[PDB]
Design an enzyme around this catalytic site. Sequence first.
Site, short mmCIF file in Angstrom:
data_model
loop_
_atom_site.label_atom_id
_atom_site.label_comp_id
_atom_site.label_asym_id
_atom_site.label_seq_id
_atom_site.Cartn_x
_atom_site.Cartn_y
_atom_site.Cartn_z
N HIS A 301 45.09 35.84 50.60
CA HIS A 301 43.68 36.20 50.67
C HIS A 301 42.88 35.23 51.55
CE1 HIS A 301 39.83 37.84 48.93
NE2 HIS A 301 39.43 36.66 49.34
N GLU A 302 42.91 33.95 51.20
CA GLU A 302 42.10 32.98 51.94
C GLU A 302 42.54 32.86 53.40
OE1 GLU A 302 39.60 32.47 50.31
OE2 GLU A 302 40.39 32.88 48.31
#
Length: 889
Positions: A301-302
């Site tokens: 995600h990040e």
Amino acid sequence: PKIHYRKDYKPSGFIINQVTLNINIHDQETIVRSVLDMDISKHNVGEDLVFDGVGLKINEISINNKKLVEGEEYTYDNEFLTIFSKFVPKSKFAFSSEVIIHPETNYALTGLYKSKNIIVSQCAATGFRRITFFIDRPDMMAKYDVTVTADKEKYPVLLSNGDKVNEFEIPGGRHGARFNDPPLKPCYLFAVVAGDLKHLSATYITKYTKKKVELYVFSEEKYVSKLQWALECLKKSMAFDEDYFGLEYDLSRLNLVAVSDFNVGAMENKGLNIFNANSLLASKKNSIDFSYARILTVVGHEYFHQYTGNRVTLRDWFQLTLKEGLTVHRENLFSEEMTKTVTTRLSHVDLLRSVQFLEDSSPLSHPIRPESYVSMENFYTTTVYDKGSEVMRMYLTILGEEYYKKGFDIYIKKNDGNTATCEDFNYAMEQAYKMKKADNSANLNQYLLWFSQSGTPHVSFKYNYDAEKKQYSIHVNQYTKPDENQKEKKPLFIPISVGLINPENGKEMISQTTLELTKESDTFVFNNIAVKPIPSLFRGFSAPVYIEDQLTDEERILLLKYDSDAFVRYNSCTNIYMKQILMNYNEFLKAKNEKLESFQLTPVNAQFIDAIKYLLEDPHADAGFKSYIVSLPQDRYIINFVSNLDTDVLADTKEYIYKQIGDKLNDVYYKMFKSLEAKADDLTYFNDESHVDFDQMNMRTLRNTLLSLLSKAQYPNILNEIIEHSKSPYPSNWLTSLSVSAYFDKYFELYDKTYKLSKDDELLLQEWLKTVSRSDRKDIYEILKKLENEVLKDSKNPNDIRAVYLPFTNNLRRFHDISGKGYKLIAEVITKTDKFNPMVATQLCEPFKLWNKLDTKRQELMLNEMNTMLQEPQISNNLKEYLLRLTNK
Ligand SMILES: [Mg+2]
Ligand SMILES: [Mg+2]
Ligand SMILES: [Mg+2]
Ligand SMILES: [Zn+2]
């Protein structure tokens, strides 16, 4: 309480071109010096210059190296720094300030704060204004030159964005590091880290430009060996975005850092991602299986924020779903590809239809792009994130892989170097929609309603088959209930992925087909259908809606056994369960309301139980999927279909249904629990932290689910299995042995055993806390007291507080105790927590979200506790706003 409105957006009358930061960390204070190189914008109308600045202690402020005098030239009220426009220059100028802040006592974990022995920032909206003065909004793009100094012994590792351009020694055992980050960025992408960090490192070479990228994963020294999986996940993430989206990492270095104290999962600051320790650190000996998929998705995600975040920023925070929904969507694609298990997609749907559906039918209901907010922190919600992701996913479903990637590229290219809105993404997808449809008049104007319309749409079906004409019809209807956001709901663009199953042989009857429902109702007709089919509807869960398939349980059973789509099989099982649950619930309810001395319950469908047995006994069937079908739907999924829910009655209902199925299948359960052992618990790669087998973890999920079923059913001599299970090397296993031992005299024995196994690992202890907290014990309230006195104490660690209390709130019988004892307990914790951490206090309100769905008594009890919390004099703005909206006040 100021309300910000989406329609009121206006560009700033100012420009911040350059930020020059000096952050001097000392023992009991942190001194921050900042020079802002500013200008007047074209939108300026001679207004006052107003900076955001929260909790800042001003030593001095200046314009063009001249000190400003307080009261005559500026005012500061601990929230806004107002500089009267007559003292604001009409051209370029330099604003400078020196403020004092105190990370050591920043327990709210926003801005600059101390977590154990690490200083770290958390700015994502509203945070940077707690570090220094700024026009703290995402459309204020600036260049950053950041210097950090600190005691070298305590903080040898200094990190921030951009390139470290200088390191130097300072008298007094101090040192400094300068970071210059030339590309423009919003302040919520600013970060600084200081501490005694240890690392694992690797070099990644990009696919096309062959650029070498340095990868660093950081943690405190004690847990540095728990960093291996994250490093591997980071490698996977970079490769996926290259292979799927053709995107390479832009910088020469990427840092990942784990900290023990963190409000959420992680944050994506440019080139420097900062993580809740529970979402970065893991080892086979010290982590439950869940941590591995968790770290994968969060790291992924990040990382997926990096490319888009480098080129396309949010115009304003109302556009949050544009970056979060899209990134969660990319995260989910990633995870499905990496895990290669159908339970990955099933787990995301399971979460959406429980937690997010509840939210969307609660008074807290909002569209994925809200029209207003008081506290921005209150809209990091499952709606913005997870419904947002489903809306983003529907673009891919509508366009298909080839044209989705075309639309995505248009988005980046068209909006490269500027801020964007949800409309900008829709426009890009609309261009691809035009190309796909071979029609320049095609548009996705209606699709915008997914962004603006709150509430979950209901989709229902009726069918017709003409045996002589070989003609099949699917009549579809859609409907969204009016709520406090829109009086009249409009029909949405609903993509319905369908198949047609031949009930005689289980074969597909038509090719891949996605019905485009754009009206309130439509009839889809299919020719050359040789036999009456069973429809397989919303394959992959192709729209975030309530599905009402109107099939018989016989038809649902056939899909469950023979359909090709994992979700529709899973949903058909769910629907069979829900029909049974609603039936038995009402029977139990009626018996209770009428005080009947005797009554009847409708037994579970015998053919349904047969189908479960069939699937369970099939070697070629998936272990994870098996675990879903022997489990009743989540309580938070169920409650969306029941008015005035009597939690006791629901508990009785669930117990009856589990007993019904167990009476028939327990021997099959026991047989599988034994036969699955060898493969599930294989220790071959127990000391290889890069070897993660998602199928194997699913086998453990199945075993632990079966063991729970057998323990609750009091299967003969199951306690023998439980004790041996406690000796397993895998935490998923021996923690399971604790919770299933609840129904036995061995519980507190295993309580002590597993505690000693857990106490020396911060994260593992938190998992132990969760297990205890979730333990199905009659003495759970005394047990919670024990945890408080002996383990939790006055910890301000959000991981600690959430672990102790949240799983307990899912105890259907005990949390919803009719005395209101559970409601009172959590309210006290919320109020206690709100004193130092408003965001986490709002998190701990989650149980109350269903308050108006319960029986009249429990509604009253919950409402009283919420009004009690609301009446607290010291209540935060976060908590106040949340409770005000939730209680419809
Ligand atoms: Mg302060
Ligand atoms: Mg953990
Ligand atoms: Mg982004
Ligand atoms: Zn994100």
